[PDB]
Design an enzyme around this catalytic site. Structure first.
Site, PDB file in Angstrom:
ATOM      1  N   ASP A  47      -8.431  -0.579  -8.140  1.00  0.00           N
ATOM      2  CA  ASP A  47      -7.741  -0.975  -6.894  1.00  0.00           C
ATOM      3  C   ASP A  47      -7.237  -2.411  -6.983  1.00  0.00           C
ATOM      4  OD1 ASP A  47      -6.723  -0.418  -4.437  1.00  0.00           O
ATOM      5  OD2 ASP A  47      -8.700  -0.677  -3.462  1.00  0.00           O
ATOM      6  N   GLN A  63      -6.162 -17.580  -3.458  1.00  0.00           N
ATOM      7  CA  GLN A  63      -6.245 -16.762  -4.694  1.00  0.00           C
ATOM      8  C   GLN A  63      -7.489 -17.167  -5.507  1.00  0.00           C
ATOM      9  OE1 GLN A  63      -4.365 -13.925  -5.843  1.00  0.00           O
ATOM     10  NE2 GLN A  63      -3.904 -13.923  -3.657  1.00  0.00           N
ATOM     11  N   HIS A  87       1.603   1.598  -5.712  1.00  0.00           N
ATOM     12  CA  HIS A  87       0.165   1.185  -5.801  1.00  0.00           C
ATOM     13  C   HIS A  87      -0.718   2.362  -6.232  1.00  0.00           C
ATOM     14  CE1 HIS A  87      -3.574  -0.722  -4.818  1.00  0.00           C
ATOM     15  NE2 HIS A  87      -3.845   0.202  -3.947  1.00  0.00           N
ATOM     16  N   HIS A 137       0.826  -1.241   0.000  1.00  0.00           N
ATOM     17  CA  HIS A 137       0.000   0.000   0.000  1.00  0.00           C
ATOM     18  C   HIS A 137       0.851   1.279   0.000  1.00  0.00           C
ATOM     19  CE1 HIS A 137      -3.366  -2.719   1.191  1.00  0.00           C
ATOM     20  NE2 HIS A 137      -4.000  -1.923   0.312  1.00  0.00           N
ATOM     21  N   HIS A 175      -6.006   7.514  -3.022  1.00  0.00           N
ATOM     22  CA  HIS A 175      -7.040   6.633  -2.386  1.00  0.00           C
ATOM     23  C   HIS A 175      -6.491   5.814  -1.204  1.00  0.00           C
ATOM     24  CE1 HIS A 175      -5.224   3.328  -4.515  1.00  0.00           C
ATOM     25  NE2 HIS A 175      -5.977   2.497  -3.830  1.00  0.00           N
TER      26      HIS A 175
END
Ligand SMILES: COCCN(C)C(=O)c1cnn(C)c1C(=O)Nc1ccn2cc(-c3ccccc3)nc2c1
Ligand SMILES: [Mg+2]
Ligand SMILES: [Zn+2]
EC number: 3.1.4.17
Length: 313
Positions: free
Chosen positions: A217, A269, A72, A68, A106
């Protein structure tokens, strides 16, 4: 004014594709963003000096965490750029301005921990913001940076256009709380399937921009497989550190956060692709057909995680 940003040929071409990776040269990322604002929005939407100053204060307020981080922020902005450029006529002037800024901002000041961990820790942010804890913070950090001297990139909008752009940003950032994505996507599925979806209805546009946010995202799942796989390592570096901190509060973490359950990542995943990512890109493609390459790349990566489970890698 007559000062275009230009990229080397390979980047000039590949930056238009959904699966572009911004590369490991951190010092090129500000230039990549301005390039994208200039093509997405116009050379006139922001004063270059103010934009550069805003970008650099945004960068400074991302932390040195595995996932993060500033890379990113820029990666999520690029996925938004590709959506906007493939849907030229669907979006308003204010939307094109607000949405790349929202994506860059964000995850501002993210600490590498989930809303869940802040609430178990009893972090002060969990008392200030009882839901969407980090996302309300990221919005609060965006407004703080916008108010620094010489950082008002929106200074030329009217009072009501400024209020509108900051509202597009606030809702776009809040929508990156994945807890909110499930019900946003269900309402969009119903709306599309019953033909009620109306892009002149503001509350519908808000839902569609929310889904675009989830799509950008989660866009590591839409990259070439080596990018996907190497990004997942950074994702788990955070999850597993959070797990460690859960074990320090005396709380058994979920398996996703327990480095001892490393073994089961591939199946984890699959769950994520099946429950979150594939449905996200499928509904986005129904609403915005030119985003189909995101769904196709996600499906390619699901098949790669299926190969990992069959020990074919
Ligand atoms: C917006 O969010 C920001 C980052 N976050 C939060 C993501 O979710 C996210 C974003 N991109 N991608 C690719 C992910 C991601 O990998 N998610 C998951 C979700 C559930 N799982 C459960 C297991 C698992 C592991 C081992 C054992 C059992 C289960 N592993 C996962 C991984
Ligand atoms: Mg976030
Ligand atoms: Zn994010």
């Amino acid at each position: 004014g007559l000062m275009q940003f230009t990229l080397p040929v390979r980047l000039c071409k590949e930056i238009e594709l959904f699966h572009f990776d911004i590369g490991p040269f951190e010092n090129m990322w500000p230039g990549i963003f301005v390039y994208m604002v200039h093509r997405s929005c116009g050379t006139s939407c922001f004063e270059l000096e103010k934009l550069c100053r805003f970008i650099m204060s945004v960068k400074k307020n991302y932390r040195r965490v595995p996932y993060h981080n500033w890379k990113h922020a820029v990666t999520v902005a690029h996925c938004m750029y590709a959506i906007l450029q493939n849907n030229h006529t669907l979006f308003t002037d204010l939307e094109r301005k607000g949405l790349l800024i929202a994506c860059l901002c964000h995850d501002l000041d993210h600490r590498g921990f989930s809303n869940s961990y802040l609430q178990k820790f009893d972090h002060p942010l969990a008392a200030l913001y009882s839901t969407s804890t980090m996302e309300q913070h990221h919005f609060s950090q965006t407004v703080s940076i916008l108010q620094l001297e010489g950082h008002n990139i929106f200074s030329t909008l009217s009072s009501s256009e400024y209020e509108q752009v900051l509202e597009i940003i606030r809702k776009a950032i809040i929508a990156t709380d994945l807890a909110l994505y499930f019900g946003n996507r269900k309402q969009l599925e119903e709306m599309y399937q019953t033909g009620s979806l109306n892009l002149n209805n503001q509350s519908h546009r808000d839902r569609v921009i929310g889904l675009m946010m989830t799509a950008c995202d989660l866009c590591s799942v839409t990259k070439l497989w080596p990018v996907t796989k190497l990004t997942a390592n950074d994702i788990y570096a955070e999850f597993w550190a959070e797990g460690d901190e859960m074990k320090k509060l005396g709380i058994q973490p979920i398996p996703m956060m327990d480095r001892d359950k490393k073994d089961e990542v591939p199946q984890g995943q699959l769950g994520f692709y099946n429950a979150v990512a594939i449905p996200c890109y499928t509904t986005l493609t129904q609403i915005l057909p030119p985003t189909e390459p995101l769904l196709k790349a996600c499906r390619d990566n699901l098949s790669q995680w299926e190969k990992v489970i069959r020990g074919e890698e």
